[PDB]
Amino acid sequence: YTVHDTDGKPVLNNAGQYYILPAKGGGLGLSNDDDGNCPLTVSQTPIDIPIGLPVRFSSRARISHITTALSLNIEFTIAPACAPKPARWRIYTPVKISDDFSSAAPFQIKKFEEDYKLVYCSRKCVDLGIKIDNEKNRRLVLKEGDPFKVKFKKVD
Amino acid sequence: IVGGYTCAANSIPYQVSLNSGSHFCGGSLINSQWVVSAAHCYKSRIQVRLGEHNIDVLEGNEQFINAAKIITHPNFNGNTLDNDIMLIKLSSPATLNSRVATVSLPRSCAAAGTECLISGWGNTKSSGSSYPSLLQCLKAPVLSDSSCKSSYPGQITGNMICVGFLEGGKDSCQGDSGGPVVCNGQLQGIVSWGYGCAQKNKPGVYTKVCNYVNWIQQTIAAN
Ligand SMILES: [Ca+2]
Structure with a gap:
């Protein structure tokens, strides 16, 4: 299926910027978890607001927007000045950001009831879920069967 | 581009726009009823728009025709994009002229x-x-x-x-x-x-x- 944003418009492929928000904690961003100095681990912001770090979704296929059948890379388009460039997602085993060339595209978006979830694939895929259900350890990690239900709010 | x-x-004049509420992919008219496109452009609902130049303005040479048959290559692989080809059969033949051609x-x-x-x-x-x-x-x-x-x-x-x-x-x-x-x-x-x-x-x-x-x-x- 075609993946839509919260305004009903199709989510763009390798273009635009979206917060990944809970379908109802705030939107995904980064937090520091055995990463040294910089927040390098994908986390849901603790505070209950529809905001996060903006994300861009990317398939090498030259369709204008994102479908549930596409293989994706995902990167934060904006991040702390210390973070790597690009701030590309890669892998409880958590999701962190990195530079390394790795030409994989292991993420997809899938329908999840009325909204979506994110999966990680090797096409055998596993659900990406919320590690701990608290303030500061709500890290995005691999978690079969407990997917984090998300929607996509386009940034202006 | x-x-x-x-x-x-x-x-x-052979270029088409595949439209599911907005443009998302292109296609090529190879005879009056059939278009060839990429298989990762597959959707269950596609409208094909022939005769287009400005896709946001009705200029008068457009023909809008719903996709009827939508057939991806049987060996298409969505991960590797091998055999990335699709055929669309239009629900009515396009009217061929100087602006819509094969x-x-x-x-x-x-x-x-x-x-x-x-x-x-x-x-x-x-x-x-x-x-x-x-x-x-x-x-x-x-x-x-x-x-x-x-x-x-x-x-x-x-x-x-x-x-x-x-x-x-x-x-x-x-x-x-x-x-x-x-x-x-x-x-x-x-x-x-x-x-x-x-x-x-x-x-x-x-x-x-x-x-x-x-x-x-x-x-x-x-x-
Ligand atoms: Ca037009």
Whole structure:
């Protein structure tokens, strides 16, 4: 299926910027978890607001927007000045950001009831879920069967 | 299309826009009832728009016809994008005229260096995003099998060719998928994929149409 944003418009492929928000904690961003100095681990912001770090979704296929059948890379388009460039997602085993060339595209978006979830694939895929259900350890990690239900709010 | 030019109106009369509420992919008219596109452009609901030049303005040469049959190649693989080809049968035949016309299937594979025309309403920028109202055109050479496979180690099957510039600049891009590469009055390519658009050593990769002539002719005849 075609993946839509919260305004009903199709989510763009390798273009635009979206917060990944809970379908109802705030939107995904980064937090520091055995990463040294910089927040390098994908986390849901603790505070209950529809905001996060903006994300861009990317398939090498030259369709204008994102479908549930596409293989994706995902990167934060904006991040702390210390973070790597690009701030590309890669892998409880958590999701962190990195530079390394790795030409994989292991993420997809899938329908999840009325909204979506994110999966990680090797096409055998596993659900990406919320590690701990608290303030500061709500890290995005691999978690079969407990997917984090998300929607996509386009940034202006 | 990055590094291209705005095509003269209806000068690519075989180009279609695949529309599911907005433009998302291109296609090529190969006879009055059938369009060829990319298989990753597959949806259960597609409207085909022929005769278009400005896709956001009704100018008077448009024909809007719903897709009836929507058939991906049986061996399409969505992860590798091998056999990335699809046929659409229109629910009524297009009216053929100077602005809506057919493009011939290939009578053989194109040599390295053959010049092609590539067109679409995809992104016109290599950094950031810009989606044009007007159809964009690009003239580009078919690249050697050697250059192609060098640019994308492990990812080029015998059903893929590269077209464009190792130096980047000029390339197709997101929103151009499924569209035509036409070289000497033949369809030799379908927009398929790349790393980014218009980056150095990352040329456009295109479905090698000459491999599928028989698949196409047979699918038409059986439907
Ligand atoms: Ca128009």
